[PDB]
Backbone atoms as SQL, in Angstrom:
CREATE TABLE atoms (id INTEGER PRIMARY KEY, chain TEXT, resi INTEGER, resn TEXT, atom TEXT, x REAL, y REAL, z REAL);
INSERT INTO atoms VALUES
  (1, 'A', 1, 'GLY', 'N', 19.687, 8.475, -21.217),
  (2, 'A', 1, 'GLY', 'CA', 19.040, 8.922, -22.462),
  (3, 'A', 1, 'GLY', 'C', 17.530, 8.981, -22.321),
  (4, 'A', 2, 'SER', 'N', 16.877, 7.820, -22.253),
  (5, 'A', 2, 'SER', 'CA', 15.531, 7.645, -21.728),
  (6, 'A', 2, 'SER', 'C', 15.549, 6.305, -20.985),
  (7, 'A', 3, 'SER', 'N', 15.720, 6.330, -19.661),
  (8, 'A', 3, 'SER', 'CA', 15.949, 5.149, -18.837),
  (9, 'A', 3, 'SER', 'C', 15.592, 5.467, -17.377),
  (10, 'A', 4, 'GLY', 'N', 15.368, 4.414, -16.593),
  (11, 'A', 4, 'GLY', 'CA', 15.061, 4.426, -15.171),
  (12, 'A', 4, 'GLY', 'C', 13.578, 4.675, -14.925),
  (13, 'A', 5, 'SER', 'N', 13.131, 4.443, -13.691),
  (14, 'A', 5, 'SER', 'CA', 11.876, 4.999, -13.213),
  (15, 'A', 5, 'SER', 'C', 11.986, 5.227, -11.702),
  (16, 'A', 6, 'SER', 'N', 11.813, 6.482, -11.279),
  (17, 'A', 6, 'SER', 'CA', 11.949, 6.965, -9.908),
  (18, 'A', 6, 'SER', 'C', 13.231, 6.491, -9.195),
  (19, 'A', 7, 'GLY', 'N', 14.323, 6.275, -9.937),
  (20, 'A', 7, 'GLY', 'CA', 15.668, 6.323, -9.387),
  (21, 'A', 7, 'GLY', 'C', 15.949, 7.767, -8.980),
  (22, 'A', 8, 'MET', 'N', 16.388, 7.982, -7.738),
  (23, 'A', 8, 'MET', 'CA', 16.851, 9.294, -7.297),
  (24, 'A', 8, 'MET', 'C', 18.186, 9.582, -7.978),
  (25, 'A', 9, 'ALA', 'N', 19.113, 8.617, -7.988),
  (26, 'A', 9, 'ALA', 'CA', 20.410, 8.782, -8.635),
  (27, 'A', 9, 'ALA', 'C', 20.245, 9.019, -10.140),
  (28, 'A', 10, 'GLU', 'N', 19.330, 8.298, -10.800),
  (29, 'A', 10, 'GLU', 'CA', 19.018, 8.563, -12.201),
  (30, 'A', 10, 'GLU', 'C', 18.480, 9.982, -12.391),
  (31, 'A', 11, 'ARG', 'N', 17.631, 10.481, -11.478),
  (32, 'A', 11, 'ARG', 'CA', 17.132, 11.851, -11.560),
  (33, 'A', 11, 'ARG', 'C', 18.276, 12.834, -11.361),
  (34, 'A', 12, 'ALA', 'N', 19.193, 12.608, -10.421),
  (35, 'A', 12, 'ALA', 'CA', 20.356, 13.466, -10.221),
  (36, 'A', 12, 'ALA', 'C', 21.211, 13.522, -11.489),
  (37, 'A', 13, 'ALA', 'N', 21.464, 12.385, -12.140),
  (38, 'A', 13, 'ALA', 'CA', 22.233, 12.329, -13.380),
  (39, 'A', 13, 'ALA', 'C', 21.503, 13.014, -14.543),
  (40, 'A', 14, 'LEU', 'N', 20.167, 12.937, -14.574),
  (41, 'A', 14, 'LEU', 'CA', 19.336, 13.620, -15.562),
  (42, 'A', 14, 'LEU', 'C', 19.396, 15.121, -15.331),
  (43, 'A', 15, 'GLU', 'N', 19.253, 15.546, -14.082),
  (44, 'A', 15, 'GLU', 'CA', 19.330, 16.935, -13.658),
  (45, 'A', 15, 'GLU', 'C', 20.725, 17.485, -13.954),
  (46, 'A', 16, 'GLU', 'N', 21.765, 16.648, -13.874),
  (47, 'A', 16, 'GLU', 'CA', 23.097, 16.979, -14.333),
  (48, 'A', 16, 'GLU', 'C', 23.067, 17.328, -15.818),
  (49, 'A', 17, 'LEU', 'N', 22.427, 16.503, -16.663),
  (50, 'A', 17, 'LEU', 'CA', 22.285, 16.821, -18.082),
  (51, 'A', 17, 'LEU', 'C', 21.556, 18.149, -18.230),
  (52, 'A', 18, 'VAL', 'N', 20.480, 18.394, -17.475),
  (53, 'A', 18, 'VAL', 'CA', 19.759, 19.660, -17.548),
  (54, 'A', 18, 'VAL', 'C', 20.695, 20.822, -17.196),
  (55, 'A', 19, 'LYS', 'N', 21.422, 20.734, -16.078),
  (56, 'A', 19, 'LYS', 'CA', 22.349, 21.737, -15.594),
  (57, 'A', 19, 'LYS', 'C', 23.393, 21.998, -16.663),
  (58, 'A', 20, 'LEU', 'N', 24.121, 20.970, -17.085),
  (59, 'A', 20, 'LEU', 'CA', 25.246, 21.066, -17.995),
  (60, 'A', 20, 'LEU', 'C', 24.783, 21.546, -19.360),
  (61, 'A', 21, 'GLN', 'N', 23.618, 21.114, -19.847),
  (62, 'A', 21, 'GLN', 'CA', 23.022, 21.624, -21.076),
  (63, 'A', 21, 'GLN', 'C', 22.725, 23.119, -20.903),
  (64, 'A', 22, 'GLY', 'N', 22.092, 23.520, -19.797),
  (65, 'A', 22, 'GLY', 'CA', 21.716, 24.903, -19.527),
  (66, 'A', 22, 'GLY', 'C', 22.928, 25.814, -19.329),
  (67, 'A', 23, 'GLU', 'N', 23.987, 25.326, -18.683),
  (68, 'A', 23, 'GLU', 'CA', 25.259, 26.020, -18.541),
  (69, 'A', 23, 'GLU', 'C', 25.956, 26.131, -19.890),
  (70, 'A', 24, 'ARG', 'N', 26.037, 25.048, -20.668),
  (71, 'A', 24, 'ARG', 'CA', 26.656, 25.114, -21.986),
  (72, 'A', 24, 'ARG', 'C', 25.917, 26.107, -22.863),
  (73, 'A', 25, 'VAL', 'N', 24.585, 26.065, -22.920),
  (74, 'A', 25, 'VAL', 'CA', 23.758, 27.030, -23.645),
  (75, 'A', 25, 'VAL', 'C', 24.050, 28.470, -23.211),
  (76, 'A', 26, 'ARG', 'N', 24.186, 28.740, -21.908),
  (77, 'A', 26, 'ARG', 'CA', 24.489, 30.065, -21.406),
  (78, 'A', 26, 'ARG', 'C', 25.860, 30.479, -21.930),
  (79, 'A', 27, 'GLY', 'N', 26.847, 29.594, -21.803),
  (80, 'A', 27, 'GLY', 'CA', 28.155, 29.784, -22.392),
  (81, 'A', 27, 'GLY', 'C', 28.037, 30.068, -23.881),
  (82, 'A', 28, 'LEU', 'N', 27.303, 29.273, -24.664),
  (83, 'A', 28, 'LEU', 'CA', 27.232, 29.447, -26.114),
  (84, 'A', 28, 'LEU', 'C', 26.717, 30.835, -26.492),
  (85, 'A', 29, 'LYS', 'N', 25.673, 31.297, -25.797),
  (86, 'A', 29, 'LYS', 'CA', 25.097, 32.622, -25.992),
  (87, 'A', 29, 'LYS', 'C', 26.141, 33.698, -25.707),
  (88, 'A', 30, 'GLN', 'N', 26.957, 33.542, -24.659),
  (89, 'A', 30, 'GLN', 'CA', 28.083, 34.404, -24.363),
  (90, 'A', 30, 'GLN', 'C', 29.158, 34.286, -25.455),
  (91, 'A', 31, 'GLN', 'N', 29.481, 33.078, -25.926),
  (92, 'A', 31, 'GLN', 'CA', 30.682, 32.764, -26.690),
  (93, 'A', 31, 'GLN', 'C', 30.532, 33.156, -28.162),
  (94, 'A', 32, 'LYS', 'N', 29.397, 33.751, -28.548),
  (95, 'A', 32, 'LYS', 'CA', 28.971, 33.930, -29.933),
  (96, 'A', 32, 'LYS', 'C', 29.203, 32.652, -30.746),
  (97, 'A', 33, 'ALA', 'N', 28.738, 31.506, -30.246),
  (98, 'A', 33, 'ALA', 'CA', 28.672, 30.305, -31.072),
  (99, 'A', 33, 'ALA', 'C', 27.575, 30.477, -32.131),
  (100, 'A', 34, 'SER', 'N', 27.468, 29.532, -33.067),
  (101, 'A', 34, 'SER', 'CA', 26.385, 29.460, -34.042),
  (102, 'A', 34, 'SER', 'C', 25.037, 29.613, -33.323),
  (103, 'A', 35, 'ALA', 'N', 24.253, 30.634, -33.686),
  (104, 'A', 35, 'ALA', 'CA', 22.872, 30.795, -33.231),
  (105, 'A', 35, 'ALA', 'C', 22.035, 29.566, -33.604),
  (106, 'A', 36, 'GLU', 'N', 22.423, 28.914, -34.698),
  (107, 'A', 36, 'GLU', 'CA', 21.809, 27.724, -35.248),
  (108, 'A', 36, 'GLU', 'C', 22.045, 26.476, -34.381),
  (109, 'A', 37, 'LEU', 'N', 23.173, 26.426, -33.666),
  (110, 'A', 37, 'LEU', 'CA', 23.474, 25.408, -32.660),
  (111, 'A', 37, 'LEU', 'C', 22.761, 25.773, -31.366),
  (112, 'A', 38, 'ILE', 'N', 22.860, 27.030, -30.930),
  (113, 'A', 38, 'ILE', 'CA', 22.217, 27.545, -29.727),
  (114, 'A', 38, 'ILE', 'C', 20.764, 27.083, -29.677),
  (115, 'A', 39, 'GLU', 'N', 19.913, 27.410, -30.656),
  (116, 'A', 39, 'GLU', 'CA', 18.519, 27.017, -30.589),
  (117, 'A', 39, 'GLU', 'C', 18.289, 25.510, -30.602),
  (118, 'A', 40, 'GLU', 'N', 19.218, 24.736, -31.148),
  (119, 'A', 40, 'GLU', 'CA', 19.149, 23.287, -31.174),
  (120, 'A', 40, 'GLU', 'C', 19.504, 22.713, -29.805),
  (121, 'A', 41, 'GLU', 'N', 20.511, 23.278, -29.156),
  (122, 'A', 41, 'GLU', 'CA', 20.937, 22.925, -27.818),
  (123, 'A', 41, 'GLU', 'C', 19.929, 23.417, -26.770),
  (124, 'A', 42, 'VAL', 'N', 19.190, 24.484, -27.071),
  (125, 'A', 42, 'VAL', 'CA', 18.064, 25.005, -26.304),
  (126, 'A', 42, 'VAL', 'C', 16.847, 24.087, -26.480),
  (127, 'A', 43, 'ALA', 'N', 16.606, 23.542, -27.675),
  (128, 'A', 43, 'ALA', 'CA', 15.553, 22.567, -27.911),
  (129, 'A', 43, 'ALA', 'C', 15.870, 21.277, -27.156),
  (130, 'A', 44, 'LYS', 'N', 17.134, 20.855, -27.116),
  (131, 'A', 44, 'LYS', 'CA', 17.557, 19.745, -26.264),
  (132, 'A', 44, 'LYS', 'C', 17.374, 20.076, -24.785),
  (133, 'A', 45, 'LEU', 'N', 17.669, 21.310, -24.364),
  (134, 'A', 45, 'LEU', 'CA', 17.403, 21.781, -23.015),
  (135, 'A', 45, 'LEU', 'C', 15.895, 21.745, -22.700),
  (136, 'A', 46, 'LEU', 'N', 15.017, 21.985, -23.683),
  (137, 'A', 46, 'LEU', 'CA', 13.564, 21.837, -23.567),
  (138, 'A', 46, 'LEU', 'C', 13.183, 20.360, -23.450),
  (139, 'A', 47, 'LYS', 'N', 13.621, 19.513, -24.388),
  (140, 'A', 47, 'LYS', 'CA', 13.324, 18.077, -24.442),
  (141, 'A', 47, 'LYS', 'C', 13.658, 17.413, -23.116),
  (142, 'A', 48, 'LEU', 'N', 14.896, 17.560, -22.645),
  (143, 'A', 48, 'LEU', 'CA', 15.334, 16.976, -21.384),
  (144, 'A', 48, 'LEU', 'C', 14.460, 17.456, -20.226),
  (145, 'A', 49, 'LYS', 'N', 14.276, 18.772, -20.017),
  (146, 'A', 49, 'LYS', 'CA', 13.401, 19.251, -18.941),
  (147, 'A', 49, 'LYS', 'C', 11.996, 18.668, -19.049),
  (148, 'A', 50, 'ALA', 'N', 11.478, 18.511, -20.265),
  (149, 'A', 50, 'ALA', 'CA', 10.170, 17.938, -20.523),
  (150, 'A', 50, 'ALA', 'C', 10.098, 16.429, -20.246),
  (151, 'A', 51, 'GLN', 'N', 11.203, 15.779, -19.869),
  (152, 'A', 51, 'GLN', 'CA', 11.227, 14.431, -19.312),
  (153, 'A', 51, 'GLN', 'C', 11.225, 14.472, -17.779),
  (154, 'A', 52, 'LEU', 'N', 12.004, 15.377, -17.173),
  (155, 'A', 52, 'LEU', 'CA', 11.992, 15.623, -15.727),
  (156, 'A', 52, 'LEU', 'C', 10.576, 15.983, -15.262),
  (157, 'A', 53, 'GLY', 'N', 9.947, 16.969, -15.913),
  (158, 'A', 53, 'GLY', 'CA', 8.637, 17.512, -15.571),
  (159, 'A', 53, 'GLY', 'C', 8.808, 18.875, -14.895),
  (160, 'A', 54, 'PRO', 'N', 8.848, 19.989, -15.651),
  (161, 'A', 54, 'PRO', 'CA', 9.158, 21.308, -15.109),
  (162, 'A', 54, 'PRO', 'C', 7.995, 21.873, -14.285),
  (163, 'A', 55, 'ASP', 'N', 8.236, 22.963, -13.553),
  (164, 'A', 55, 'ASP', 'CA', 7.198, 23.640, -12.775),
  (165, 'A', 55, 'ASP', 'C', 6.222, 24.341, -13.711),
  (166, 'A', 56, 'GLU', 'N', 4.971, 24.443, -13.267),
  (167, 'A', 56, 'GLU', 'CA', 3.841, 24.996, -13.994),
  (168, 'A', 56, 'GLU', 'C', 3.891, 26.525, -14.022),
  (169, 'A', 57, 'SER', 'N', 4.856, 27.109, -14.726),
  (170, 'A', 57, 'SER', 'CA', 4.986, 28.556, -14.837),
  (171, 'A', 57, 'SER', 'C', 3.956, 29.123, -15.828),
  (172, 'A', 58, 'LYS', 'N', 2.718, 29.267, -15.341),
  (173, 'A', 58, 'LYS', 'CA', 1.459, 29.610, -16.010),
  (174, 'A', 58, 'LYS', 'C', 1.044, 28.547, -17.033),
  (175, 'A', 59, 'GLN', 'N', -0.261, 28.465, -17.305),
  (176, 'A', 59, 'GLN', 'CA', -0.847, 27.534, -18.262),
  (177, 'A', 59, 'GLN', 'C', -0.324, 27.805, -19.679),
  (178, 'A', 60, 'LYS', 'N', -0.521, 26.836, -20.580),
  (179, 'A', 60, 'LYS', 'CA', 0.020, 26.857, -21.937),
  (180, 'A', 60, 'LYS', 'C', -0.975, 26.229, -22.903),
  (181, 'A', 61, 'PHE', 'N', -1.201, 24.914, -22.824),
  (182, 'A', 61, 'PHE', 'CA', -2.018, 24.168, -23.782),
  (183, 'A', 61, 'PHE', 'C', -1.591, 24.376, -25.250),
  (184, 'A', 62, 'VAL', 'N', -0.311, 24.679, -25.495),
  (185, 'A', 62, 'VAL', 'CA', 0.282, 24.595, -26.825),
  (186, 'A', 62, 'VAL', 'C', 0.209, 23.125, -27.248),
  (187, 'A', 63, 'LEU', 'N', -0.387, 22.858, -28.412),
  (188, 'A', 63, 'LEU', 'CA', -0.518, 21.511, -28.959),
  (189, 'A', 63, 'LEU', 'C', 0.847, 20.944, -29.347),
  (190, 'A', 64, 'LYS', 'N', 0.849, 19.676, -29.758),
  (191, 'A', 64, 'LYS', 'CA', 2.011, 18.978, -30.285),
  (192, 'A', 64, 'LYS', 'C', 1.624, 18.152, -31.508),
  (193, 'A', 65, 'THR', 'N', 2.641, 17.695, -32.220),
  (194, 'A', 65, 'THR', 'CA', 2.591, 16.657, -33.236),
  (195, 'A', 65, 'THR', 'C', 1.982, 15.366, -32.658),
  (196, 'A', 66, 'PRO', 'N', 1.481, 14.445, -33.503),
  (197, 'A', 66, 'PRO', 'CA', 0.718, 13.291, -33.049),
  (198, 'A', 66, 'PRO', 'C', 1.635, 12.253, -32.395),
  (199, 'A', 67, 'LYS', 'N', 1.851, 12.381, -31.082),
  (200, 'A', 67, 'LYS', 'CA', 2.702, 11.507, -30.270),
  (201, 'A', 67, 'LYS', 'C', 4.048, 11.263, -30.956),
  (202, 'A', 68, 'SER', 'N', 4.759, 12.345, -31.273),
  (203, 'A', 68, 'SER', 'CA', 6.025, 12.281, -31.992),
  (204, 'A', 68, 'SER', 'C', 7.071, 11.388, -31.308),
  (205, 'A', 69, 'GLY', 'N', 7.086, 11.364, -29.971),
  (206, 'A', 69, 'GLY', 'CA', 8.036, 10.618, -29.157),
  (207, 'A', 69, 'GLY', 'C', 9.509, 10.881, -29.505),
  (208, 'A', 70, 'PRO', 'N', 9.987, 12.142, -29.551),
  (209, 'A', 70, 'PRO', 'CA', 11.360, 12.468, -29.911),
  (210, 'A', 70, 'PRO', 'C', 12.321, 12.039, -28.801),
  (211, 'A', 71, 'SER', 'N', 12.891, 10.852, -28.960),
  (212, 'A', 71, 'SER', 'CA', 13.976, 10.334, -28.154),
  (213, 'A', 71, 'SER', 'C', 15.284, 10.864, -28.763),
  (214, 'A', 72, 'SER', 'N', 16.391, 10.152, -28.597),
  (215, 'A', 72, 'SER', 'CA', 17.691, 10.489, -29.153),
  (216, 'A', 72, 'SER', 'C', 18.549, 9.226, -29.075),
  (217, 'A', 73, 'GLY', 'N', 19.688, 9.235, -29.764),
  (218, 'A', 73, 'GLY', 'CA', 20.681, 8.184, -29.736),
  (219, 'A', 73, 'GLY', 'C', 21.385, 8.099, -31.074);
């Protein structure tokens, strides 16, 4: 959920969540599921990747809420 520090196995299991979330999202877009679930599962796909630390695909500097710390459970 939010656990470990520089565990390789923990990163593999996290990357599994990223993969499976991203595959499920791809499926949902295909499956004509609720668009309202899709964007929520896509926001979870964003949140999780934003814990891994994604590649710098051009600069952004989009601001955020004041240290919101959106965990889950």
